[PDB]
Design a protein around this ligand. Structure first.
Ligand SMILES: *Cc1cc2c(cc1C)nc1c(=O)[nH]c(=O)nc-1n2C[C@H](O)[C@H](O)[C@H](O)COP(=O)(O)OP(=O)(O)OC[C@H]1O[C@@H](n2cnc3c(N)ncnc32)[C@H](O)[C@@H]1O
Ligand code: HEM
Ligand SMILES: O=C([O-])[C@H](O)C=C([O-])O
Ligand code: SF4
Ligand code: F3S
Ligand code: FES
Ligand code: NA
Lengths: 238, 588, 121, 105
C-alpha cells in the first residue's frame, strides 16, 4: 500500500527559497508504523533529507515537527493518525524558528528564553540539611507535571505570542520551567525570581490561547503553570 | 596550521551523564574546558534511563556500602576490578546526595528522604535478604538526572559546543593524545580542538545490533576513535542484554517493573523465574534472567502474537494507583509500542541489547591505559574516558541495574577531581604537527571523495544482522568464526562505501556515515573478543565452552588494535578498606 | 539570511485560538466604534432637531447593518472577556477540554445577543 | 510594569460591564424612543456620572489594549510611536467630547 508525503525542503547552498517536495513510500499494508520510521526510510531513498532524531521513544525531544498542520514528535505519531484518503501527509519545520536546513530548526531563542528564567535550584545554604534536603511527598507532588518536560519546543513554537516576541515573551516551555523552580520547596529565591518576571512581556504576553496544552507530547499544561505564576505575581506586587 | 585551532585545558567529548559531571567538575577546579556533543546535551541517551541509581543511601532500610560492593562483585561474575568497585560503592552515597542538592527531583519516602526501590541483584548482609537501594524519580530517573546536570552546566557557564561531531583523536609525534578534530554539524566547518586532556565520554553502541534499547545515536564513536588511534579496548565481548525490552519494538521497560513486584510468566502461565533462580527470583542478575527467558522461548514455552516470540511480564496486580505513580513512564511506553495497557494486561517482553560492559581501559582517575610489548599497563598521555565508553572496570561481565548512572556520576566526578594531578603527572606534551592534524581527517576525506562506491545503508543492515544472529545472548564456536568472516567482508565493503550528500549545511548523511565506521570498529572488536574467550561468564555464554573457567579466564580480555590480536589483563582483587571477595560459584 | 516557517495557512488553529484572535479583533473594532457611537450620541442631544436627524440616520438600512455589527463585536468582546476573567479568578478550569467547552458556550451566548441586538435595531 | 497593566485592564472591564448592563437595561425596557424620554434619562445625574466614569475607563482599558496590539505587530519604533500618539489623542478626545456633550445637557 502506497503512502504519499509533501515535505519541506531547504538548502541555503542550493535553494532560492524553501519548497515542498513529493515523496512516495511503499508501506507494509498490515503493520502500522511511526512517522519517524517513514522519515528514516525516505532517507535511504533520498540521502539528502535532513531531520533530527534520537531516542525514537518520545523522551528526548529531538524530532518536533509540524505534521498535518499541528506540532508533535515523529517517533510517536503513528502513520495511521496522519494518513487520509487522497491527501498527502504534510511535514514542515516547527513554526516561528529559523530554518537551518530541511526539517531542522535553529532552537537558539527557545533555549535562550529557557536560560533567562534561571532554570537551576537556588538554595542560599542556610539551615543545610544533614543529608538530602527533606521534601515531603506532599511538596514533591508539586513538581509533577512540570519536571517531565523534554524541551522539544512543540508548545512554544505553536504559540502566537512567542512568534511575535520570541525574545521578550518567555514562552510556554520557559514559563513551565520557571514555575518548576518557583514551587520547588528546596529553592529559596522565589521572591527574587518573581521580581524578574514582573515586566510587561515575560509572563503577561500569554493570552490563554491554549495551543501549548494541545500540542505537548508529554501532556503537560503550561497554561495552568502560567496561571500559577500570575497568581504569585499579584500576590506579591499588588 | 591551515585549520582553525581552539585550545582548552580539557576537551570533554560527550555531554551525557558522565560527560556533564566531569565538565562541571573540571570547570569548578579552575581549568578551562570545552564540552562537545553531537546532539544537544539533553538528548543524550542518559535521558532515556528509567530505573534509578543504585547506592547505599540506607533510606528504605539500613544499608551498608560493602553489601552493595558484594552484590556488584558477584554480579560482575568476579571480573570486576574490586578496588574500583569499592571506590564506587563507598563514594556513591555522598556523590548522589550531591545531585539532590543540585535539585534533582527524586521521589520521596513519607518522612522526606529520597525514595529507593528494590532492583535486580540487591541483597542485605552479603547475599542475604532482598534489598531496596535504587534511588529514583518515578521511572524517569535518567531524564531527571540529565536535565539537572544540564541546568548545573548552565548555572556554571560551561562552554558547550552543541552539535559538533568528533571525527578522530590527534596524536603528537610522541604518541600522546593532544585533542581531536571535530565537524560542526550546522555549518560544516572542521576544527582542531587542542587540549592537554581529551576526555572521551561518548556512551554505548547498542546500535551494532538489529534490536537494541539504545538511541539511534549510540554508535560507539568512542570505540572507533580509540581503536583508530591505536588504543586497546577491553572485555568487548561483554554485552548486557536487558531481560525486558518490548517485543518487536526494542524500547525498554524498566527492571523497576520487577522491583515493584511484577514477575515473568511463560505461555503456560507459570512463573518460571522461581525455578531458574530460587532465591532472587525475578530479581536475579540480568544475564541470568535474559537466558532464562530465552530457554523458555527456545523450547516452545514462550508466547506469540503481533509482537512475535516473547515472555509475559505481569504488573496488573500492583494496581492503577501504584502503577501511575511509581512507573508512569512505562505505562506510556507500553501503550505506545506494544498497544498494551499494563494496568489490565501483561507486557510482551524479550531480552534486548542494552549496555556495553566493555570499553576503553581506565584507572579510577579516568586516565586511559594501554599495554607495552611486555604486557604491562602504561597510561596513554592526554587521553581519558568516563561513563559507558569506559571499562574501569566496575561491571566485569554483568552490570547491576542502577549501577550505570552511579558510575557516570562517581567516575565523571573523579576524572575531574583528579585532572589537575593527572596533567602534572603526564608532563607537558609536545605539539601536534600539521600533518598530525591532517591524519585525523583521513577518514572524513575518504567519504567526501567517494561518490561511486557502495551503499552504506546495505552495509549497516548486514552488519547488525551479523551481530544479532552470531553474537546474541547464546554463542557458539562455529557461529562466531563465521560471523567474524562476514565482518571482514562487510568491513571491506565499507572502505569503498559512498557519501551521497555532498552538502555542508546540516548534512546528516555525512554524520551517519562517519558513525557507520564506528559501528564497524566496535562490532569487529566485539567479535574478535567473543571468539577469543573460551568459557562462559556473566553475559558471555558459549555452548561449546559452557563452564566458567577461573583457572584461565579470571581476567580481562584486551583487543590490540594494531596487530588485531587478543591478550589478557589482570582483574584487581585488592580493595583498600575490606578484604577481597574470593571468586566462588555464582547462582541466584 | 535565514528563512522561517510561519505560513499561517499551513497551521491548524484550535477553537480556543480562534476565539482569542476574534477577541483581539473585536476589541480593536470596539475602539473605533466608540468614536462613531459618540458622534451619534452628540448629535442626538444637541437639539430637538439634531435628534430627529439622528433618528433618520438610524433609519438607513446600511447604517442599521453597521450598527448591528458594532453591537455584535461589543457583545463578543464583552462575553469572551468575562470568560477570560473567569479563568483569571479560577472559576473556569485551565484544561484544554474546559477551554474548548467554554469557548463554544461563549459563541452561543454571543449569537443569542447578536440576535437580540438585531431586534433592538 | 505588567502586573499593574493586568489589574487595570481587568478593573476597568468590571466597571464597563456594569455600565453596559445599565445601558442595555434602559434600552430593552423603554419602548417608544421619544426625544423626551431620551433627554430625561441623559439629564439625570446618575446617567451623567456613570458615563463619564465609563469614558475614563475606556481611556485606560483601551489604551492598554491598543498598546498590546501595537507592540505585537508594529516593529519600527518611529511608526509605532506615531500610532500610539494618534490613539492616545483619540482617547483623550473621547473623554473631553463626552464632557462637552453631557455637561451640556
Ligand atoms: C539505553 C538505556 C540505558 C539505560 C537506561 C535506559 C536506556 C533506554 N536506564 C538506566 C537506569 O535507570 N539506570 C542505570 O544505571 N542505567 C540505565 N541505562 C544505562 C545508562 O543510562 C547509560 O549507560 C548512561 O546513560 C551512560 O551515560 P554516558 O554519559 O556514558 O553516555 P550517553 O548518556 O549516551 O552520552 C553520550 C554523549 O556522547 C556524545 N557523542 C557520542 N559520540 C560523539 C561524537 N562522535 N562526537 C561528539 N559527541 C559524541 C553524544 O552526543 C552524547 O552527548
Ligand atoms: C467598550 C470599550 C472597550 C474597548 C474599546 C476595548 C478594547 C480592548 C482592546 C483593544 C484590547 C486588547 C486585546 C488584546 O490584548 O488582544 C482589550 C482587551 C481586553 N478586554 Fe476590552 N475593550 C472594551 C470593553 C471591554 C469590556 C466591557 C470587557 C469586559 C470583560 C473587556 C474585556 C477585556 C479583557 C479581559 C482584555 C484583556 C484580555 C487579554 O489580554 O487577552 N473589554 N480590550
Ligand atoms: O531497567 C531499568 O530501568 C534500567 O535499564 C536500569 C539499568 O541499570 O540499566
Ligand atoms: S512543555 Fe511539553 S510541548 Fe513544551 S517543551 Fe516541554 S515537552 Fe515540549
Ligand atoms: S499557547 Fe501561547 S498564549 Fe499562553 S496559554 Fe499558551 S503560551
Ligand atoms: S526521537 Fe527522541 S522524542 Fe522523537
Ligand atoms: Na563500558
Amino acid at each position: 500500500m502506497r503512502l504519499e508525503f509533501s515535505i519541506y525542503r531547504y538548502n541555503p547552498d542550493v535553494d532560492d527559497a524553501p519548497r515542498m517536495q513529493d515523496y512516495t513510500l511503499e508501506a507494509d499494508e498490515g503493520r502500522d508504523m511511526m512517522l519517524l520510521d517513514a522519515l528514516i526510510q525516505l532517507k535511504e531513498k533520498d540521502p539528502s533529507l535532513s531531520f533530527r532524531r534520537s531516542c525514537r521513544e518520545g523522551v528526548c525531544g529531538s524530532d518536533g515537527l509540524n505534521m498535518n498542520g499541528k506540532n508533535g514528535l515523529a517517533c510517536i505519531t503513528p502513520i495511521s493518525a496522519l494518513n487520509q484518503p487522497g491527501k498527502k501527509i504534510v511535514i514542515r519545520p516547527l513554526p516561528g524558528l529559523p530554518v537551518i536546513r530541511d526539517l531542522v530548526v535553529d532552537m537558539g531563542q527557545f533555549y535562550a528564553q529557557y536560560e533567562k528564567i534561571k532554570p537551576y535550584l537556588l538554595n542560599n545554604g542556610q539551615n543545610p540539611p544533614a543529608r538530602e534536603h527533606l521534601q515531603m511527598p506532599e511538596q514533591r507532588e508539586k513538581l509533577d507535571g512540570l519536571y517531565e518536560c523534554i524541551l522539544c519546543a512543540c508548545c512554544s513554537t505553536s504559540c502566537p505570542s512567542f512568534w511575535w516576541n520570541p525574545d521578550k515573551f518567555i514562552g510556554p516551555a520557559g514559563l513551565l520551567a520557571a514555575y518548576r523552580f518557583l514551587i520547588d520547596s528546596r529553592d529559596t529565591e522565589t521572591d527574587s525570581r518573581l521580581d524578574g518576571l514582573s515586566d510587561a512581556f515575560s509572563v503577561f504576553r500569554c493570552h490563554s490561547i491554549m495551543n501549548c496544552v494541545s500540542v505537548c507530547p508529554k501532556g503537560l499544561n503550561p497554561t495552568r503553570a502560567i496561571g500559577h505564576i500570575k497568581s504569585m505575581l499579584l500576590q506579591r506586587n499588588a | 596550521m591551515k585549520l582553525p585551532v581552539r585550545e582548552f585545558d580539557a576537551v570533554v567529548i560527550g555531554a551525557g551523564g558522565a560527560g556533564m559531571r566531569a565538565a562541571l567538575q573540571i570547570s569548578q577546579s579552575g581549568q578551562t574546558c570545552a564540552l562537545l556533543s553531537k546532539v544537544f546535551p539533553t538528548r543524550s541517551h542518559t535521558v532515556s534511563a528509567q530505573g534509578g541509581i543504585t547506592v547505599a543511601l540506607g533510606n528504605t532500610h539500613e544499608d551498608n556500602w560493602e553489601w552493595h560492593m558484594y552484590d556488584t562483585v558477584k554480579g560482575s561474575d568476579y571480573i570486576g576490578d574490586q578496588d574500583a568497585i569499592e571506590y564506587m560503592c563507598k563514594t556513591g552515597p555522598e556523590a548522589i546526595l550531591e545531585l539532590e542538592h543540585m535539585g534533582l527531583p527524586f521521589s520521596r519516602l513519607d518522612d522526606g528522604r529520597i525514595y529507593q526501590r528494590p532492583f535486580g541483584g540487591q541483597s542485605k548482609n552479603f547475599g542475604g535478604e532482598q534489598a531496596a537501594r535504587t534511588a529514583a524519580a518515578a521511572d524517569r530517573t535518567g531524564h531527571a538526572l540529565l536535565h539537572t546536570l544540564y541546568q548545573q552546566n548552565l548555572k556554571n557557564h560551561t562552554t558547550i559546543f552543541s552539535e559538533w561531531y568528533a571525527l578522530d583523536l590527534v596524536k603528537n609525534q610522541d604518541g600522546a593524545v593532544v585533542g581531536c578534530t571535530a565537524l560542526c554539524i550546522e555549518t560544516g566547518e572542521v576544527v582542531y580542538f587542542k587540549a592537554r586532556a581529551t576526555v572521551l565520554a561518548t556512551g554505548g553502541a547498542g546500535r551494532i545490533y538489529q534490536s537494541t534499547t539504545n538511541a539511534h545515536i549510540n554508535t560507539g564513536d568512542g570505540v572507533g576513535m580509540a581503536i583508530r588511534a591505536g588504543v586497546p579496548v577491553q572485555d568487548m565481548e561483554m554485552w548486557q542484554f536487558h531481560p525486558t525490552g518490548i517485543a518487536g519494538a526494542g524500547v525498554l521497560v524498566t527492571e523497576g517493573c520487577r522491583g515493584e513486584g511484577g514477575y515473568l510468566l511463560n505461555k503456560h502461565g507459570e512463573r518460571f523465574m522461581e525455578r531458574y533462580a530460587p532465591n532472587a527470583k525475578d530479581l536475579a542478575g540480568r544475564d541470568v534472567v535474559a537466558r532464562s527467558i530465552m530457554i523458555e522461548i527456545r523450547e516452545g514455552r514462550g508466547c506469540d502474537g503481533p509482537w512475535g516470540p516473547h515472555a509475559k511480564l505481569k504488573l496488573d496486580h500492583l494496581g492503577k494507583e501504584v502503577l501511575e505513580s511509581r512507573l508512569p513512564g512505562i505505562l506510556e511506553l507500553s501503550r505506545t509500542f506494544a498497544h498494551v495497557d499494563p494496568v489490565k494486561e501483561p507486557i510482551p517482553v524479550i531480552p534486548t541489547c542494552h549496555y556495553m560492559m566493555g570499553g576503553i581501559p581506565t584507572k579510577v582517575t579516568g586516565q586511559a591505559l594501554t599495554v607495552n610489548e611486555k604486557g604491562e599497563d602504561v597510561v596513554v598521555p592526554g587521553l581519558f574516558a568516563v561513563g559507558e565508553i569506559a571499562c574501569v572496570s566496575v561491571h566485569g561481565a554483568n552490570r547491576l541495574g542502577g549501577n550505570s548512572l552511579l558510575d557516570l556520576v562517581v567516575f565523571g566526578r573523579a576524572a575531574g577531581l583528579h585532572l589537575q594531578e593527572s596533567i602534572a603527572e603526564q608532563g607537558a606534551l609536545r605539539d601536534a604537527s600539521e600533518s598530525d592534524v591532517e591524519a585525523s581527517l583521513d577518514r572524513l576525506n575518504r567519504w567526501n571523495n567517494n561518490r561511486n562506491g557502495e551503499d552504506p545503508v546495505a552495509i549497516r543492515k548486514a552488519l547488525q544482522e551479523c551481530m544479532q544472529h552470531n553474537f546474541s545472548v547464546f554463542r557458539e564456536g562455529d557461529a562466531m568464526a563465521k560471523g567474524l568472516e562476514q565482518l571482514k567482508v562487510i568491513r571491506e565493503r565499507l572502505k569503498n562505501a559512498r557519501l551521497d550528500d555532498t552538502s555542508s549545511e546540516f548534512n546528516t548523511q555525512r554524520v551517519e556515515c562517519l558513525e557507520l565506521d564506528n559501528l564497524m570498529e566496535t562490532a569487529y572488536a566485539t567479535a574478535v573478543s567473543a571468539n577469543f574467550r573460551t568459557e562462559s561468564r556473566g553475559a558471555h555464554s558459549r555452548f561449546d565452552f559452557p563452564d566458567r573457567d577461573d583457572e584461565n579466564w579470571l581476567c580481562h580480555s584486551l583487543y590490540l588494535p594494531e596487530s588485531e590480536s587478543m591478550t589478557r589483563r589482570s582483574v584487581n582483587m585488592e580493595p583498600k578498606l575490606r578484604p577481597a571477595f574470593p571468586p566462588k560459584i555464582r547462582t541466584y | 539570511q535565514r528563512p522561517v516557517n510561519l505560513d499561517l495557512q499551513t497551521i491548524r488553529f484550535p477553537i480556543t485560538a480562534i476565539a482569542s484572535i476574534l477577541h483581539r479583533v473585536s476589541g480593536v473594532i470596539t475602539f473605533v466604534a466608540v468614536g462613531i457611537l459618540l458622534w451619534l450620541l452628540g448629535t442626538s442631544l444637541s437639539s430637538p432637531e439634531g435628534f430627529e436627524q439622528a433618528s433618520a440616520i438610524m433609519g438607513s438600512f446600511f447604517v442599521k447593518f453597521i450598527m448591528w455589527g458594532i453591537l455584535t463585536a461589543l457583545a463578543y468582546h464583552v462575553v469572551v472577556g468575562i470568560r477570560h476573567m473567569m479563568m483569571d479568578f479560577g472559576y473556569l478550569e485551565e484544561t484544554f477540554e474546559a477551554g474548548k467547552r467554554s469557548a463554544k458556550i461563549s459563541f452561543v451566548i454571543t449569537v443569542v445577543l447578536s440576535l437580540l441586538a438585531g431586534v433592538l435595531v | 510594569n505588567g502586573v499593574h497593566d493586568f489589574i487595570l485592564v481587568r478593573a476597568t472591564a468590571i466597571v464597563l460591564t456594569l455600565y453596559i448592563i445599565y445601558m442595555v437595561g434602559f434600552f430593552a425596557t423603554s419602548g417608544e424612543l421619544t426625544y423626551e424620554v431620551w433627554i430625561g434619562f441623559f439629564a439625570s445625574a446618575f446617567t451623567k456620572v456613570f458615563t463619564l466614569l465609563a469614558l475614563f475607563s475606556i481611556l485606560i482599558h483601551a489604551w492598554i489594549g491598543m498598546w498590546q496590539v501595537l507592540t505585537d505587530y508594529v516593529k519600527p519604533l518611529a511608526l509605532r510611536l506615531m500610532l500610539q500618539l494618534v490613539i492616545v489623542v483619540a482617547l483623550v478626545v473621547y473623554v473631553i467630547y463626552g464632557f462637552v456633550v453631557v455637561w451640556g445637557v
